[PDB]
Design an enzyme around this catalytic site. Structure first.
Site, PDB file in Angstrom:
ATOM      1  N   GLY A  89       0.779  -1.223   0.000  1.00 18.61           N
ATOM      2  CA  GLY A  89       0.000   0.000   0.000  1.00 18.61           C
ATOM      3  C   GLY A  89       0.814   1.278   0.000  1.00 18.61           C
ATOM      4  O   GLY A  89       2.011   1.270   0.291  1.00 18.61           O
TER       5      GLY A  89
ATOM      6  N   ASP B  38      12.571  -6.626   4.666  1.00 20.97           N
ATOM      7  CA  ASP B  38      12.714  -5.740   3.517  1.00 20.97           C
ATOM      8  C   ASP B  38      13.311  -4.377   3.844  1.00 20.97           C
ATOM      9  O   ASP B  38      12.773  -3.342   3.456  1.00 20.97           O
ATOM     10  CB  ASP B  38      11.352  -5.579   2.836  1.00 20.97           C
ATOM     11  CG  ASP B  38      11.461  -4.987   1.444  1.00 20.97           C
ATOM     12  OD1 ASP B  38      12.438  -5.306   0.731  1.00 20.97           O
ATOM     13  OD2 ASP B  38      10.561  -4.215   1.056  1.00 20.97           O
TER      14      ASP B  38
END
Ligand code: L0F
Length: 283
Positions: free
Chosen positions: A16, A123
């Site tokens: 998102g 990440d």
């Protein structure tokens, strides 16, 4: 969501878009993250509610979790700038090493905290590392990976098909960022999964059973993999002093099991003279 008035898009996260927004009620400015449609799986909800608990000085605080109209919004404390922008802004003179060392120390503390709770980031990248006018840097997007694109900071075991990686993947990512800050150039700027892997092999040498026992039967390893020799760190990260290179090399060990932990890294001699400089940032 109605109780927030988007002011602008500050980034395109993984799950998102992220927006800077002002709460219509409280008046506080914050970072609103819209997630992603089945209605938002339950498992997702709970993984998110746990992340709402692990609070640390080096982790972007998740203020509120909003699941409205089968939609998901995460409200995070707002930070002044991301590491990426600050790095670009310092491409002329480079980030003072004392500041680089402070940022690394703090980040390692954050990971140390997350890892002790069995939570991984997976990440890490200059875009989700956030800084403020007080000399602090914090991790953002933590735990979202589990709950639910650059390949430059991806650990070799993830590239090789390993499915149940550990926390060491974060340590690898941080090492890549550490080097980038020092050299002002991406360590392994790959543009496809194989190019990333081979960039790593070219600099650190192709891994084998010796340096990485078991690497040869990993899901995506190919014996046809070219055989590159390992380069010396003096050539890879000058002008990083020896303690720095010594630390970096352990953060970049192929075998995830030999790779230094955040915990052990904090005790490395590189941090013996660590201070907490304040950055000169333009907002
Ligand atoms: O969560 C992300 N960013 C943020 C959370 N709180 N404050 C921020 C923030 N991001 C900025 C970027 C530029 C300038 C100021 C900023 N403040 C996030 C996560 C993934 C990708 C990008 C941002």
């Amino acid at each position: 969501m109605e109780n927030f008035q988007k002011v602008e898009k500050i980034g395109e996260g993984t799950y998102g878009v992220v927006y800077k927004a002002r709460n219509k009620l409280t008046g506080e400015v914050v970072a609103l993250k819209k997630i992603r449609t089945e209605g938002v799986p339950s498992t997702a909800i709970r993984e998110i509610s746990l992340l709402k608990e692990l609070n640390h000085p080096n982790i972007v605080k998740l203020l509120d979790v909003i699941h409205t109209e089968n939609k998901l919004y995460l409200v995070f404390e707002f930070l002044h700038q991301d590491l990426k922008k600050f790095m670009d802004a310092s491409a002329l003179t480079g980030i003072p090493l004392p500041l680089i060392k402070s940022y690394l120390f703090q980040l390692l503390q954050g990971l140390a905290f997350c890892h002790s709770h069995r939570v991984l980031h997976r990440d890490l990248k200059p875009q989700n590392l956030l800084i403020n006018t007080e000399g602090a840097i914090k991790l953002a997007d933590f735990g979202l990976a589990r709950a639910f694109v650059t390949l430059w900071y991806r650990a070799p075991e993830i590239l090789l098909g390993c499915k149940y990686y550990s926390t060491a993947v974060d340590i690898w990512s941080l090492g890549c960022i550490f080097a980038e800050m020092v050299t002002r150039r991406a360590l392994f700027p790959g543009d496809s999964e194989i190019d990333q892997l081979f960039r790593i092999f070219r600099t650190l040498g192709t891994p084998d059973e010796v340096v990485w026992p078991g690497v040869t039967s990993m899901p995506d390893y190919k014996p046809s993999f070219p055989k590159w020799a390992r380069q010396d760190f003096s050539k890879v990260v000058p002008p990083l002093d020896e303690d720095g290179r010594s630390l970096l090399s352990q953060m970049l060990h192929y075998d995830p099991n030999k790779r230094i932990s955040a915990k052990a890294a904090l005790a490395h001699p590189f941090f013996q003279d660590v201070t907490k400089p304040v950055p000169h940032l333009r907002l």
